[PDB]
Amino acid sequence: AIRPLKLADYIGQPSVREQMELFIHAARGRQEALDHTLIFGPPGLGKTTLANIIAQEMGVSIKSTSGPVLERPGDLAALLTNLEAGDVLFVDEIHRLSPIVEEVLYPAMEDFQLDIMIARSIKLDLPPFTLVGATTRAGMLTNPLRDRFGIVQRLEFYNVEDLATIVSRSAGILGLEIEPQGAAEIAKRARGTPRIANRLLRRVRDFAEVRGQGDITRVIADKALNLLDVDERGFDHLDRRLLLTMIDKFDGGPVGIDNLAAALSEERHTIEDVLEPYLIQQGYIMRTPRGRVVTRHAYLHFGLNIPKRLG
Ligand SMILES: Nc1ncnc2c1ncn2[C@@H]1O[C@H](COP(=O)(O)OP(=O)(O)O)[C@@H](O)[C@H]1O
């Protein structure tokens, strides 16, 4: 209900919205498939949502898959051969395609031709289609794959004013009364993401209905977020454990990503793709050639003294 199904409802990414509206209206005007589109940025920013909007606005079907799911060239082939003219094939986590599966994608995208080995090479014609790929950052794709995308959109963390607009819109859809400052409190602590802002709104609604009067106020939002263990900066338990581990076990860094992951019992990709991007963006962590380091702001956040020493 609250997820935008069309570009008109896509708030907080004006450049992306304006560009996509233009490219889609142009492709439809020519009765052609939209050019292959790459969407990148952090998780929860609406990559899957945008992919679905593309299919919706184009008036076509969307087939969704993921880089890890396509273990063999034939798995990709099966999807490609099942598309109708103009359909969207959405491949989330596209940077995790195995090098050999990625090879099949090159002619499928560029020439609408399937070229697969079975030994014998088989060449088959494909109907026009749109590949929508998503990854956390564009630089982690090869140059050949990257260069086959005709449209490239970059999603960035949302500013707090736009997140508040999104929270207020969602509250309206849910029939909830919300004060401006209530929407602001949630937006402030939503970690720059509409996914999180919307989830937090649902949990705040619960608190309002059970412990309050049913409406969303700044005080109700604050108490509810405190119960959820989400702090004033939008940091959750894992975010704080990451920063505190860097401070306590590694003296603030520098610490290599593998050492940090092992110290947290978390995988590398989790720290790099899920935890770190917002923390770096907000100025709490910095990457250096010798490893990640916390900034003085990490110490200040926890009421700790800033150490003064040499590097
Ligand atoms: N521009 C936007 N405006 C309002 N809500 C959004 C926007 N982008 C995403 N959302 C919301 O955030 C959620 C996350 O979208 P999703 O496509 O799953 O992100 P990703 O695929 O990047 O992890 C969606 O369920 C949707 O409700």
UniProtKB/Swiss-Prot annotation:
Positions of the region Head domain (RuvB-H)? 232-311
* Keyword set, alphabetical order: ATP-binding, Cytoplasm, DNA damage, DNA recombination, DNA repair, DNA-binding, Hydrolase, Nucleotide-binding
Principal localization reads: cytoplasm
**Residues covered by region (Small ATPAse domain (RuvB-S)):** 159-229
The reaction(s) annotated as catalysed by this protein in its Swiss-Prot or TrEMBL entry are: ATP + H2O = ADP + phosphate + H(+)
* A GO-annotated cellular component: Holliday junction resolvase complex
The subcellular localization recorded is: Cytoplasm
GO biological processes: cellular response to chromate; cellular response to selenite ion; DNA recombination; DNA repair
Under Enzyme Commission nomenclature, its number is: 3.6.4.-
Question: Sorted alphabetically, which InterPro entries does this protein's record hold?
Answer: AAA+_ATPase (IPR003593), AAA_lid_4 (IPR041445), DNA_helicase_Holl-junc_RuvB (IPR004605), P-loop_NTPase (IPR027417), RuvB-like_N (IPR008824), RuvB_C (IPR008823), WH-like_DNA-bd_sf (IPR036388), WH_DNA-bd_sf (IPR036390)
Alphabetized GO MF terms: ATP binding; ATP hydrolysis activity; four-way junction DNA binding; four-way junction helicase activity
Q: Where, in this chain's numbering, is ADP bound?
A: 11, 44-49, 158
Name the positions where DNA binds: 268, 287, 292
**Where Mg(2+) is bound, by residue?**
48
Question: Which residues does the annotation say bind ATP?
Answer: 2-3, 44, 47-49, 110-112, 148, 195
> Which stretches does the entry tag as region Large ATPase domain (RuvB-L)?
1-158
Any idea what job this protein has? The RuvA-RuvB-RuvC complex processes Holliday junction (HJ) DNA during genetic recombination and DNA repair, while the RuvA-RuvB complex plays an important role in the rescue of blocked DNA replication forks via replication fork reversal (RFR). RuvA specifically binds to HJ cruciform DNA, conferring on it an open structure. The RuvB hexamer acts as an ATP-dependent pump, pulling dsDNA into and through the RuvAB complex. RuvB forms 2 homohexamers on either side of HJ DNA bound by 1 or 2 RuvA tetramers; 4 subunits per hexamer contact DNA at a time. The RuvA-RuvB complex in the presence of ATP renatures cruciform structure in supercoiled DNA with palindromic sequence, indicating that it may promote strand exchange reactions in homologous recombination. Complements an E.coli deletion mutant.
Q: What quaternary arrangement does the UniProt entry report?
A: Homohexamer. Forms an RuvA(8)-RuvB(12)-Holliday junction (HJ) complex. HJ DNA is sandwiched between 2 RuvA tetramers; dsDNA enters through RuvA and exits via RuvB. An RuvB hexamer assembles on each DNA strand where it exits the tetramer. Each RuvB hexamer is contacted by two RuvA subunits (via domain III) on 2 adjacent RuvB subunits; this complex drives branch migration. In the full resolvosome a probable DNA-RuvA(4)-RuvB(12)-RuvC(2) complex forms which resolves the HJ.
The UniProt record's further free-text remark is: Probably part of a ruvC-ruvA-ruvB operon. Does not seem to belong to the SOS regulon, no LexA binding site has been identified in the promoter region.
What PANTHER family has UniProt attached to this entry?
HOLLIDAY JUNCTION BRANCH MIGRATION COMPLEX SUBUNIT RUVB, PTHR42848
- Domain note for this entry? Has 3 domains, the large (RuvB-L) and small ATPase (RuvB-S) domains and the C-terminal head (RuvB-H) domain. The head domain binds DNA, while the ATPase domains jointly bind ATP, ADP or are empty depending on the state of the subunit in the translocation cycle. During a single DNA translocation step the structure of each domain remains the same, but their relative positions change.
Similarity remark = Belongs to the RuvB family.
Q: Report the protein name in the record.
A: Holliday junction branch migration complex subunit RuvB
Q: What is the lineage of its organism?
A: Bacteria, Pseudomonadati, Pseudomonadota, Gammaproteobacteria, Pseudomonadales
